[PDB]
Design a protein around this ligand. Structure first.
Ligand SMILES: *[C@@H]1O[C@H](CO)[C@@H](O)[C@H](O)[C@H]1NC(C)=O
Ligand SMILES: *[C@@H]1O[C@H](CO)[C@@H](O)[C@H](O)[C@H]1NC(C)=O
Ligand SMILES: *[C@@H]1O[C@H](CO)[C@@H](O)[C@H](O)[C@H]1NC(C)=O
Ligand SMILES: *[C@@H]1O[C@H](CO)[C@@H](O)[C@H](O)[C@H]1NC(C)=O
Ligand SMILES: *[C@@H]1O[C@H](CO)[C@@H](O)[C@H](O)[C@H]1NC(C)=O
Length: 252
């Protein structure tokens, strides 16, 4: 009987973004008859059970009554980049968002991701310790009753990382109220330098142009131990500071 021959028949769901309708592809070799041109049932509404009566000349009545459990709307899911701005240079957070309600039960909805060669099974995923200034291709798919109905790829860039630290050539007093700091610039990309002079509980900071490699410090307490801090910062999706290069000298 056709009900016997096709009792365990399987289906693949193909979404049309223009029509907002699904096509059910019947996983059979022979050209089957319904009541389904090229073994495809077209124009199926999302999250609605539809019935198809299947037969073929190679089998007798009763027909196989096949229930199509149609998945949710492909446009109702959005692959969102949830990366926290402060950690954008070393992390990736990807999450599928449910942008519109659907009637399908969510317990039958499964999300899968593939980043490098790592495979994840969850609505959201998080990658850490990534090297800054690189691009990664994360592939993802959504299953309904273990049936893939949608997929997407997300190419993500790991934002400008923290620069430096700079290499201090020297820092010495050259007058009773003066001290000089000279350095070499740090290796990564940055916007400016931040110089600090520390006299015990006291601390005053500055802002130096990326192009300078020397600084003069006037109006200082004579015969006093000073500590200079120097780091370079970059204004990325957040201000990222490089590690500080310490310096010590004592006035004349
Ligand atoms: C139904 O599907 C056919 C193609 O199989 C298409 O030509 C037709 O416009 C669709 N009708 C509706 C109402 O979506
Ligand atoms: C379709 O039918 C099955 C039983 O065959 C039922 O459990 C399921 O809830 C129905 N699908 C939807 C979308 O409600
Ligand atoms: C969905 O998956 C298939 C098979 O892996 C792939 O060929 C297709 O390109 C994917 N869809 C998109 C939009 O990339
Ligand atoms: C660098 O420092 C100067 C002086 O403090 C300032 O005018 C400039 O806007 C700073 N650069 C950036 C990118 O903030
Ligand atoms: C970076 O350094 C500045 C001084 O240059 C400091 O005021 C600020 O707290 C630091 N920024 C961040 C985001 O840690």
């Amino acid at each position: 009987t056709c009900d016997e021959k096709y009792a365990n028949i399987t289906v693949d769901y193909l979404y049309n973004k223009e029509t907002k309708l699904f096509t059910a592809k019947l996983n059979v070799n022979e050209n089957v008859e319904c009541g389904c041109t090229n073994n495809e049932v077209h124009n199926l509404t999302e999250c609605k059970n539809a019935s198809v009566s299947i037969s073929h000349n190679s089998c007798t009545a009763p027909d196989k009554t096949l229930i199509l459990d149609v998945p949710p709307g492909v446009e109702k899911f959005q692959l969102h980049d949830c990366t926290q701005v402060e950690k954008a240079d070393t992390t990736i957070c990807l999450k599928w968002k449910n942008i519109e309600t659907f009637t399908c039960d969510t317990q039958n909805i499964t999300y899968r991701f593939q980043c490098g060669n790592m495979i994840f099974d969850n609505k959201e995923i998080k990658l850490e310790n990534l090297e800054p200034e690189h691009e990664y291709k994360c592939d993802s798919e959504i299953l309904y009753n273990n049936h893939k109905f949608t997929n997407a790829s997300k190419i993500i860039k790991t934002d400008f990382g923290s620069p430096g630290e700079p290499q201090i050539i020297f820092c010495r007093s050259e007058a009773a109220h003066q001290g000089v700091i000279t350095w070499n610039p740090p290796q990564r990309s940055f916007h400016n330098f931040t110089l600090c002079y520390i006299k015990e509980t006291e601390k005053d900071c500055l802002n130096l142009d990326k192009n300078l490699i020397k600084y003069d410090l006037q109006n200082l307490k004579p015969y006093t131990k000073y500590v200079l801090s120097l780091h370079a910062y970059i204004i990325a999706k957040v201000q990222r500071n490089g590690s500080a290069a310490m310096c010590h000298f004592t006035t004349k």
